[PDB]
Motif scaffolding. Structure first.
Motif, PDB file in Angstrom:
ATOM      1  N   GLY A  34      16.097 -57.631 -29.800  1.00  0.00           N
ATOM      2  CA  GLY A  34      14.772 -58.212 -29.917  1.00  0.00           C
ATOM      3  C   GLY A  34      14.375 -58.320 -31.371  1.00  0.00           C
ATOM      4  N   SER A  35      13.353 -59.131 -31.631  1.00  0.00           N
ATOM      5  CA  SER A  35      12.910 -59.346 -33.002  1.00  0.00           C
ATOM      6  C   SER A  35      12.377 -58.052 -33.600  1.00  0.00           C
ATOM      7  CB  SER A  35      11.841 -60.433 -33.050  1.00  0.00           C
ATOM      8  OG  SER A  35      10.737 -60.091 -32.237  1.00  0.00           O
ATOM      9  N   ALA A  36      12.552 -57.906 -34.908  1.00  0.00           N
ATOM     10  CA  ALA A  36      12.243 -56.652 -35.571  1.00  0.00           C
ATOM     11  C   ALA A  36      10.738 -56.448 -35.720  1.00  0.00           C
ATOM     12  CB  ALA A  36      12.907 -56.593 -36.944  1.00  0.00           C
ATOM     13  N   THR A  37      10.358 -55.175 -35.783  1.00  0.00           N
ATOM     14  CA  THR A  37       8.975 -54.779 -35.992  1.00  0.00           C
ATOM     15  C   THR A  37       8.972 -53.404 -36.635  1.00  0.00           C
ATOM     16  OG1 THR A  37       8.248 -56.052 -34.073  1.00  0.00           O
ATOM     17  CG2 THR A  37       6.756 -54.382 -34.917  1.00  0.00           C
ATOM     18  N   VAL A  38       8.034 -53.178 -37.545  1.00  0.00           N
ATOM     19  CA  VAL A  38       7.857 -51.891 -38.197  1.00  0.00           C
ATOM     20  C   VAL A  38       6.419 -51.453 -37.985  1.00  0.00           C
ATOM     21  CG1 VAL A  38       9.452 -52.759 -39.925  1.00  0.00           C
ATOM     22  CG2 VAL A  38       7.032 -52.555 -40.472  1.00  0.00           C
TER      23      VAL A  38
ATOM     24  N   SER B 100       2.922 -53.173 -30.390  1.00  0.00           N
ATOM     25  CA  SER B 100       3.884 -54.197 -30.787  1.00  0.00           C
ATOM     26  C   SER B 100       5.091 -54.046 -29.876  1.00  0.00           C
ATOM     27  CB  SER B 100       4.278 -54.046 -32.249  1.00  0.00           C
ATOM     28  OG  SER B 100       3.199 -54.354 -33.109  1.00  0.00           O
ATOM     29  N   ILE B 101       5.465 -55.120 -29.195  1.00  0.00           N
ATOM     30  CA  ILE B 101       6.591 -55.049 -28.280  1.00  0.00           C
ATOM     31  C   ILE B 101       7.864 -55.472 -29.000  1.00  0.00           C
ATOM     32  CG2 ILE B 101       5.035 -55.543 -26.380  1.00  0.00           C
ATOM     33  CD1 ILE B 101       6.174 -58.301 -26.220  1.00  0.00           C
TER      34      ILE B 101
ATOM     35  N   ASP C 126       8.655 -57.291 -18.468  1.00  0.00           N
ATOM     36  CA  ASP C 126       7.966 -56.049 -18.156  1.00  0.00           C
ATOM     37  C   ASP C 126       7.412 -55.427 -19.426  1.00  0.00           C
ATOM     38  OD1 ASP C 126       8.516 -56.399 -15.528  1.00  0.00           O
ATOM     39  OD2 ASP C 126      10.193 -54.986 -15.457  1.00  0.00           O
ATOM     40  N   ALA C 127       6.738 -56.232 -20.228  1.00  0.00           N
ATOM     41  CA  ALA C 127       6.014 -55.769 -21.401  1.00  0.00           C
ATOM     42  C   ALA C 127       4.545 -56.121 -21.334  1.00  0.00           C
ATOM     43  CB  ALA C 127       6.625 -56.361 -22.674  1.00  0.00           C
TER      44      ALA C 127
ATOM     45  N   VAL D 199      11.483 -52.003 -22.700  1.00  0.00           N
ATOM     46  CA  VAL D 199      10.623 -52.532 -23.750  1.00  0.00           C
ATOM     47  C   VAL D 199      10.415 -51.452 -24.793  1.00  0.00           C
ATOM     48  CG1 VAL D 199       8.427 -53.578 -24.313  1.00  0.00           C
ATOM     49  CG2 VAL D 199       9.473 -54.011 -22.109  1.00  0.00           C
ATOM     50  N   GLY D 200      10.628 -51.809 -26.063  1.00  0.00           N
ATOM     51  CA  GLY D 200      10.328 -50.928 -27.160  1.00  0.00           C
ATOM     52  C   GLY D 200       8.886 -51.130 -27.570  1.00  0.00           C
TER      53      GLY D 200
END
Lengths: 237, 226, 88, 67, 248, 237, 237, 222, 238
Positions: free
Chosen positions: A29-33, A70-71, A77-78, A127-128
């Motif tokens: 999945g696309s990155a997120t910080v 932020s997913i 299922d987010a 889901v993160g």
């Protein structure tokens, strides 16, 4: 491999395999910080675009005035988890008129997602989550993995090639408590920019920011709202 | 799925395996005489540690309905408990018909929760039922999947084949008085390996007066002079 | 050592493959083969060779051995066979 | 598996000049069912050598060494 | 992985489970229904005739299911019992609701609807049983119906459902005559076809069970022909056979 | 491989595909519009001497202004008929205006779609076709595939021989040959009559003349129309 | 297949799941003996305590089901505790529904019925613990019964269960065949010498836990260290 | 593997990767969101002339200010479109105003995967306070704002062509002709009025059929 | 196993539950813990692996408070461990609501153990991947400490350890002489034992979460004051 087929079954070597596969959903999945501070929590998400004509999709979802998530992973299922967290926060508001403290919310999410990891026929919530909240104990950043084992973090990132962002956050995390809002946001922006390949670079259209502070309720800044933070980028792709 | 299931093209493979299990090894002969019915069975306990007055193979489901069975005693209990509840419910609804033989056919029919709703795993017991509240006796058999068979004399044991052969050869017949229990004990003798005794052999009789599980005293009395 | 790969022809690679293949046959490059190169995203070099073979086959089916100026027929056969390859 | 060798004891003990020594490490977990008569029976105590045994084995070790 | 039943199609598009059950219905059991004016009758073959039975149920194949009809199964007895119970329940529920005996076609349609549901949805086995029905109503008079486990019933007037059903129906087609058919000649035809489909000649009256439905004065009478009447029918058939054979 | 109500690796829905191919096993069924009369035929060739022809029921009524024709599994088709009839009466009960052909066909298609959904229910292997005069004069004809869909056709041509008979219809679907009621009937014949031998009485026609009841064509008149078709065939050397 | 994997009848006509479940009782490494006497019923099982960090106070395998019924479990301890809880619930519920205390035979019958339900169906699995429960019953003397993972409840005078149950049963068969009644001393000494001959360790009065139910003294006396030591001294005399 | 819920060994559960590739067997549809409005074009692809063209419809108006174009299993499209209508009507009845196209798309996405997943992709387009808007919803309950989207069997080629023929300041008049020429290049036959459907979105108009066999004024230029 | 180790409802040919036999392996693999019954209370301890310095101060702590006087030190799959801790909290609250007072530790352990066994009995649900000590103290019943394995039953423990290195911990636990040592020196010694167990020899730095219950805390199971037990950690370091 038989033992990897189902979530319920348990591998002879130890931990089950379906849960271990579920973390790959957030890996893909696309990155997120997301980083804390002395007084603010900031999320920087790489809004992954399908094609130049289509929009860059939506990340950094909104939950309440003091909590925003932020997913990173299975979008299906987010929105469900977003609905659950919104519902719980509104329930807390309804019962005792106080913002639901984030830690209690994260424990609720962990318990809610734990059950599908043991009930047959139910896939884990791959889901993160990067929850940013401001309870009474300053800003908080929590990471929720599909294995339902949440974590607290000074600064954590999830997504594709997020290990580089993790390393940058670790190396600069000593100087995180004492940073102005813009300084911290630019820290996060540098961390996220270090993720995508050198050809890619930050744009006002492909990034999203979620800021929550003591006097600043959760706000989702972007392009126009983002440019003032994007300035002073110090671009080293 | 959650019923009597596993029926391939022209077969009931699970039911056939259940009957292979009901082949069992407890002979449990039954004879329908003119005066009444006798259900005799073999209680060959492993060693002398076990007891014989503790557990029984013959169960009076009601006033004059007696019941004997075959392999899978744990299933047979549950089945006889269900049968008692069913006969009692019928007697409660149709109040005071002293229902045994006008109820023996009916309880054999209500032995459909017996098997037509197997319960994922079908029952593994075939049971003989005796009743005499009609002025006439009745001996029925219900098998792990079929229905009331309405026997006159049969056996359900490991050597049920030669037991039934013995019954027909010794002429189960129709004029036989109530004391065809001697012939029943003879039929058991054939499918029995030992000096059978009162606790070793358990027999119930259902005549027009009612049903009664013969105590070891009478069983030994009959076994004497054989 | 030195594990390398490609098999990912972009527009420039596909049009260069078109050029090297059109070096064969009785075709010339006055055809707007860039249009077909765009028409097929990532069609290997094998499928480009196949499309050139199909162009020659269409020419001989028309019984015209000429393929240098036979460009509209070139484009037509290439696009219809791209249609067929995607869904026949 | 040890009970197998135990019932082997009728392996013509009169005829066969075969015995079996059990060199266990610790006699702690040795299945006390295997120490009844008819079982392994005899156990001899061996522990770390005392000072006397230690000096004796040192002497025999130094035997081949002539310096 | 968990076991799942087969209520599905074929690569061609066939319900081969239902087809196998329907073919297995031919295996085991033998019944036949012949429709005639002023009386329609069923004949059944007593499969097991061991001398150690007592015949106290009075009926094994033929079942009285209503005042104005009677059915006959040819399937697995386990399903047959519950199906007959449901059939009687349906007929009596109609009687309660409309205060009028249920028309035979409506009864058969209800039963075939339940079998169609059983083969349609859920992980439930198809009802491996095919049965005939003979009945009388106000609208169509004497009627005969044949229902297969597929739930696709059919309104017949001379049919068989047993093992040698093909041979029986061929015999019925050869020696069936509509209109002229009456109750007695219908009985003669039924016993003749049963003798044909049962290899042992001179069928004992114990091995054959037959029931006739007749219309008395404003009332339907369903009489199961007992042993003496059946064997008198057998004797009359035997006289006819001897006469026909010797006259050549 | 996999033949249940789940998506196959290439797409499609293989159980639904099997059900759709099942209709083949069945009977031909044709029917036409014409603004004067809707007529549909089935043509059956298989009635032994001992079975009563009354209860074949290849075409049936719903609301005395709508008639449907079987093509496929008879039991499934009959159940669909019963349910559609019940719903037609329900839509008469509520919304007092009589049922519309499109409405009842939509209900049938929705039922079929509902049964295709989920693994439990077999996907109703019957392709139906429903004709009839609407309340506002216009007679219509829809054909519903077993999967979930319906389509307003001028000619249906469903079942065995469907491809050839539909080709014949679309070859000469002349509205000038439609014109009168008899012209419509004779057009449905010599089209259904083409399928199989159709010699003596296999043709089973059905008629809905505007506001009249469902007319089932009498056999002698059917032979009369066959003779008329033969007359038209003659003088054409 | 799956004949040996689920609780279904074998093609040979056997039930392999319960046949396996019986061997689960032997698994776990323990044995237990029960001897009915002239007036009392005494049972005894070894107390395998590895390392003394455990609490020998609570490692027991015998329990009071009610004020007069005492049970000894054999097999997996989790299932053993579950069945002990179920038996206690059944005893209390029986005392509530019917005034008089539950007879031991009836209690064993109910436990056996529960186990028989377990071996029926396929969702659950049988519990791998065989239970020997004893108690004084009026007009019956002492009573001992054994419920097994199958549902067959019986067992009397002398019955044993565990790994080396067969040898114990053989010795107890010899003793009972020796026609002499055991008083409230010979019964205990017989049980002790039986278990000691099975597992010759001379039984230091700390590795067995014996339960006693006499007639003049009801109740399930879990005999203390001093009592078992006194019985051991008297026996080895 | 085969289980609708079990994840793949690598990163992403299967059978939804199978449901998404149903627009492949679906029919082609394109939509342009301009400042003027939204232009929705599809192809009916009639198989036989006897079938009424009016019967085959890929574009349905969910409400007066939302139109939807399906691509895939019209059976599932029927259920999704019905749920969209019900949700729009419920929102209007509750709040006495026009539900946003984004909110409608969000509701449909929530209902998309909650039963084997639906295998249809939707192109919602409609006016709102945020001008005309267009959304691409996918079988896997995922929705995305788009300005010029293509979907169907020829999704790749159509979208690639649209990517270079589209510009940010176009009008309805140019959008329709661009969509139609792309459709003609994409399909097999020509864009006859009996085979091509068109749907217009206007800020001050309800979204109606395109002239109806009087839309040849937009195909003759083509 | 191969064929029989797929669902807990399938017994082994020898008569074993391989699903639980494998669920024990996750506990064997996860990081260790320890709990010692001091003379007048119970002291817990568990090393927590800080997998990354990105994490804040010790979070997802292996210690939990299930009730006022009861504490749970868990090891194994942490998510299911937390869900089980919630089950325990609910059980304690329900017992307090019904029967009043506080839940006795033996009964609480027995009830949670029966609940766990319910999750290994069936087939649709899977055994819990966690093992935990429940420790409590009261004036009436002294100090009790029960360990529950992923499928087994509660057992009274003077001192227990679970996790990656059970035997290595238990050796020195049994070396230690409990039953006469106060909870202070026990809080020192448990840290000593954890530090004796490998922390960085093959892994990262570890955090020392230590818990208390006893008359020195008048019950009221609480985490030991970490500021003042940093010196106890130092003594462990030496």
């Amino acid at each position: 491999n038989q033992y990897d087929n189902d979530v319920t079954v348990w591998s002879p070597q130890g931990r089950i395999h379906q849960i271990e596969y579920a973390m790959e959903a957030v890996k893909q999945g696309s990155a997120t910080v997301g980083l804390k501070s002395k007084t603010h929590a900031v999320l920087v998400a790489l809004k992954r675009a399908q094609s130049e004509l289509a929009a860059h999709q939506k990340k950094i979802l909104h939950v309440d005035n003091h909590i925003g998530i932020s997913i990173a992973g299975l979008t299906a299922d987010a929105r469900l988890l977003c609905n659950f967290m919104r519902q719980e926060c509104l329930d807390s508001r309804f019962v005792f008129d106080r913002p639901l403290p984030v830690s209690r919310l994260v424990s609720l999410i962990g318990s809610k997602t734990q059950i599908p990891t043991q009930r047959y026929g139910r896939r884990p919530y791959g889901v993160g989550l990067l929850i940013a909240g401001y309870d009474d104990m300053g800003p908080h950043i929590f990471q929720t993995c599909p294995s339902a084992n949440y974590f607290d973090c000074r600064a954590m990132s999830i997504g594709a090639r997020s290990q580089s962002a993790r390393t940058y956050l670790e190396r600069h995390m000593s100087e995180f408590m004492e940073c102005n809002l813009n300084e911290l946001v630019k820290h996060g922006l540098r961390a996220l920019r270090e993720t995508l390949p050198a050809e890619q670079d930050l744009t006002t259209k492909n990034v999203s920011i979620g800021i929550v502070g003591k006097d600043l309720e959760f706000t989702i800044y972007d392009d126009d709202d983002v440019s003032p933070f994007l300035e002073g980028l110090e671009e080293r792709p | 799925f959650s019923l009597t299931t596993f029926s391939p093209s022209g077969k009931l493979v699970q039911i056939e395996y259940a009957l292979a299990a009901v082949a069992g090894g407890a002979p449990s002969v039954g004879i329908k005489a003119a005066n009444g019915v006798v259900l005799a069975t073999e209680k060959k306990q492993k060693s002398i540690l076990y007891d014989e007055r503790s557990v029984h193979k013959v169960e009076p489901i009601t006033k004059h309905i007696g019941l004997v069975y075959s392999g899978m005693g744990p299933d047979y209990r549950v089945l006889v408990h269900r049968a008692r509840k069913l006969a009692q419910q019928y007697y409660l609804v149709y109040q005071e018909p002293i229902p045994t033989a006008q109820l023996v056919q009916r309880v054999a029919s209500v032995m459909q929760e017996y098997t037509q709703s197997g319960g994922v795993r079908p029952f593994g017991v075939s049971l003989l039922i005796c009743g005499w509240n009609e002025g006439r006796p009745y001996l029925f058999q219900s098998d792990p999947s079929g229905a009331y068979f309405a026997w006159k004399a049969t056996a359900m044991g490991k050597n049920y084949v030669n037991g039934k052969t013995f019954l027909e050869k010794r002429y189960n017949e129709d004029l036989e008085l109530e004391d065809a229990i001697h012939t029943a004990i003879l039929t058991l003798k054939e499918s029995f390996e030992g000096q059978m005794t009162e606790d070793n052999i358990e027999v119930g009789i259902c005549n027009e007066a009612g049903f009664r599980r013969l105590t070891p005293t009478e069983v030994k009395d009959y076994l004497a002079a054989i | 050592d030195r594990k390398i790969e490609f098999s990912l022809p972009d527009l420039e690679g596909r049009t260069h493959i078109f050029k090297i293949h059109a070096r064969s046959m009785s075709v010339e490059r006055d055809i707007r083969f860039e249009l077909l190169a765009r028409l097929c995203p990532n069609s290997t070099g094998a499928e480009i060779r196949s499309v050139c073979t199909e162009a020659g086959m269409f020419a001989i089916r028309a019984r015209r051995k000429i393929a240098t100026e036979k460009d509209f027929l070139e484009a037509v056969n290439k696009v219809i066979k791209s249609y067929a390859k995607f869904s026949a | 598996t040890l009970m197998e060798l135990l019932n082997q004891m009728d392996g013509f003990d009169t005829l066969h000049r075969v015995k079996m020594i059990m060199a266990t490490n610790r006699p702690d977990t040795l299945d006390p069912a295997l120490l009844r008569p008819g079982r392994l029976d005899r156990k001899i105590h061996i522990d770390l050598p005392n000072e006397q045994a230690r000096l004796d084995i040192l002497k025999i070790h130094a035997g081949p060494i002539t310096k | 992985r968990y076991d799942s039943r087969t209520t599905i199609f074929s690569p061609e598009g066939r319900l081969y489970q239902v087809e196998y059950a329907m073919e297995a219905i031919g295996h085991a059991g033998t019944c036949l229904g012949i429709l005639a004016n002023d009386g329609v009758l069923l004949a059944a073959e007593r499969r097991n005739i061991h001398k150690l039975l007592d015949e106290v149920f009075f009926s094994e194949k033929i079942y009285k299911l209503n005042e104005d009809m009677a059915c006959s199964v040819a399937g697995i007895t386990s399903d047959a019992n519950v199906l007959t119970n449901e059939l009687r329940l349906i007929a009596q529920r109609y009687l309660l609701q409309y205060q009028e005996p249920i028309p035979c076609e409506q009864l058969v349609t209800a039963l075939c609807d339940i079998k169609q549901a059983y083969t349609q949805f859920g992980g439930k086995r198809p009802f491996g049983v095919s049965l005939l029905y003979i009945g009388w109503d106000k609208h169509y008079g004497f009627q005969l119906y044949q229902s297969d486990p597929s739930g696709n019933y059919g309104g017949w007037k001379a049919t068989c459902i047993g093992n040698n059903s093909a041979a029986a129906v061929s015999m019925l087609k050869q020696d069936y005559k509509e209109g002229e058919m009456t109750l007695k000649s219908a009985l003669a035809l039924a016993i003749k076809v049963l003798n044909k489909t049962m290899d042992v000649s001179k069928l004992s009256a114990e091995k054959v069970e037959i029931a006739t439905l007749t219309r008395e004065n404003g009332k339907t009478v369903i009489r199961v022909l007992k042993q003496k009447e059946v064997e008198q029918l057998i004797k009359k058939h035997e006289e006819e056979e001897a006469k026909a054979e010797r006259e050549k | 491989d996999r033949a249940i109500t789940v998506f196959s690796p290439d797409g499609h829905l293989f159980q639904v595909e099997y059900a759709q191919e099942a209709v083949k096993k069945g009977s031909t069924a044709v029917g036409v519009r014409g603004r004067d009369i809707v007529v549909l035929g089935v043509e059956k060739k298989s009635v032994a001497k001992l079975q009563d022809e009354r209860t074949v029921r290849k075409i049936c009524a719903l609301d005395d202004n709508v008639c449907m024709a079987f093509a496929g599994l008879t039991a499934d088709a009959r159940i669909v008929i019963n349910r559609a009839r019940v719903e037609c009466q329900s839509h008469r009960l509520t919304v007092e205006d009589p049922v519309t052909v499109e409405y009842i066909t939509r209900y049938i298609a929705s039922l079929k779609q509902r049964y295709t959904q989920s693994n439990g229910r077999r996907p109703f292997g019957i392709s139906a076709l429903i004709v009839g005069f609407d309340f506002d004069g216009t007679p219509r004809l829809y054909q519903t595939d077993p999967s979930g869909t319906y389509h307003a056709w001028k000619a249906n041509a469903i079942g065995r021989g469907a491809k050839s008979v539909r080709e014949f219809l679309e070859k000469n679907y002349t509205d000038e040959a439609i014109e009168t009621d008899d012209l419509t009937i004779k057009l449905v014949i010599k089209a259904l009559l083409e399928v199989v031998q159709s010699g003596g009485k296999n043709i089973e026609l059905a008629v809905m003349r505007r506001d009249q009841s469902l007319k089932i064509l009498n056999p002698e008149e059917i032979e009369k129309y066959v003779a008329e078709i033969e007359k038209e065939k003659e003088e054409n050397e | 297949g799956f004949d040996r994997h689920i609780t279904i009848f074998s093609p040979e006509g056997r039930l392999y799941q319960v046949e396996y479940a019986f061997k689960a009782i032997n698994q776990g490494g323990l044995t237990s003996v029960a001897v009915r006497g002239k007036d009392c019923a005494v049972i005894v099982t070894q107390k395998k305590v590895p390392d003394k960090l455990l609490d020998s106070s609570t490692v027991t395998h015998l329990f009071k089901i009610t004020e007069n019924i005492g049970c000894v479990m054999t097999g997996m301890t989790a299932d053993s505790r579950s069945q002990v809880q179920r038996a206690r619930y059944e005893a209390a519920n029986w005392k509530y529904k019917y005034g008089y205390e539950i007879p031991v035979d009836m209690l064993c019958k109910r436990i056996a019925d529960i186990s028989q339900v377990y071996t029926q169906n396929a969702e659950m699995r049988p519990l791998g613990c065989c239970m020997i429960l004893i108690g004084i019953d009026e007009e019956q003397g002492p009573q001992v019964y054994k419920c097994d993972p199958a549902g067959y409840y019986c067992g009397f005078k002398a019955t044993a269960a565990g790994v080396k149950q067969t040898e114990s049963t053989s010795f107890l068969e010899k003793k009972v065949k020796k026609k002499f009644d055991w008083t409230f001393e010979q019964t205990v000494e017989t049980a002790i010498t039986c278990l000691s001959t099975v597992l010759s360790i001379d039984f230091k009065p700390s590795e067995i836990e014996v339960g006693v139910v006499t007639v003049e003294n009801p109740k399930f006396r879990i005999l203390t260290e001093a009592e078992i030591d006194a019985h051991l001294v008297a026996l080895a005399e | 593997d085969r289980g609708v819920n079990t994840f793949s060994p690598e990163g992403r559960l299967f059978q939804v990767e199978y449901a998404i590739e149903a627009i492949k067997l679906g029919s082609t549809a394109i939509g342009i969101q301009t400042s003027e409005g939204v232009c929705l074009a599809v192809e009916k692809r009639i198989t036989s002339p006897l079938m009424e063209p009016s019967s085959i419809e890929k574009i349905v108006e969910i409400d007066a200010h939302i139109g939807c174009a399906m691509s895939g299993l019209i059976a599932d499209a029927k259920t999704l479109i019905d749920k969209a209508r019900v949700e729009t009507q419920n929102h209007w009845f509750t709040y006495n105003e026009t539900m946003t196209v984004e909110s409608v798309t969000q509701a449909v996405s929530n209902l998309a995967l909650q039963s084997r997943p639906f295998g249809v992709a939707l192109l919602f387009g409609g006016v709102d306070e945020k001008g005309p808007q267009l959304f691409h919803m996918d079988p896997s309950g995922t929705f995305v704002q788009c300005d010029a989207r293509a979907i169907g069997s020829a999704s790749e080629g159509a979208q690639s062509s649209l990517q270079e023929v589209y510009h940010k300041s176009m009008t309805l008049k140019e959008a329709i002709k661009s969509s139609l020429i792309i459709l003609k290049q994409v399909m097999e036959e020509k864009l006859n009025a009996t085979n091509i459907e068109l749907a217009t979105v206007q800020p001050g108009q309800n979204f109606h059929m395109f002239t109806k066999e009087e839309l040849e004024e937009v195909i003759k230029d083509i | 196993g191969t064929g029989y180790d797929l669902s807990a409802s399938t017994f082994s040919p020898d008569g074993r539950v391989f699903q639980v036999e494998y669920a024990m392996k996750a506990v064997e693999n996860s990081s260790t813990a320890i709990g010692i019954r001091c003379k007048d209370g119970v002291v817990f301890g568990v090393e927590k692996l800080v997998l990354s310095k990105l994490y804040e101060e010790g979070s997802n702590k292996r210690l939990f408070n299930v009730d006022r006087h009861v504490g749970m030190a868990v090891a194994g799959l942490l998510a299911d461990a937390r869900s089980l801790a919630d089950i325990a909290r609910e059980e304690a609250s329900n017992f307090r609501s019904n029967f009043g007072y506080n839940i006795p530790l033996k009964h609480l352990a027995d009830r949670v153990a029966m609940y766990v066994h319910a999750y290994t009995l069936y087939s649709a649900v899977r055994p819990f991947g966690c093992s935990f000590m429940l420790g409590s103290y009261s004036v009436n019943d002294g100090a009790q400490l029960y360990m529950i394995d992923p499928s087994g039953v509660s057992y009274g423990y003077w001192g227990c350890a679970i996790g990656k290195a059970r035997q290595a911990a238990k050796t020195e636990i049994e070396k230690l002489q409990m039953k006469e040592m106060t909870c202070r020196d026990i809080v020192k010694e448990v840290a000593k034992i954890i530090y004796i167990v490998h922390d960085e020899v093959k892994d990262k730095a570890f955090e020392l979460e230590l818990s208390w219950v006893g008359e020195l805390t008048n019950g009221r199971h609480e985490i030991v004051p970490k500021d003042i037990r940093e010196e106890a950690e130092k003594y462990a370091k030496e």
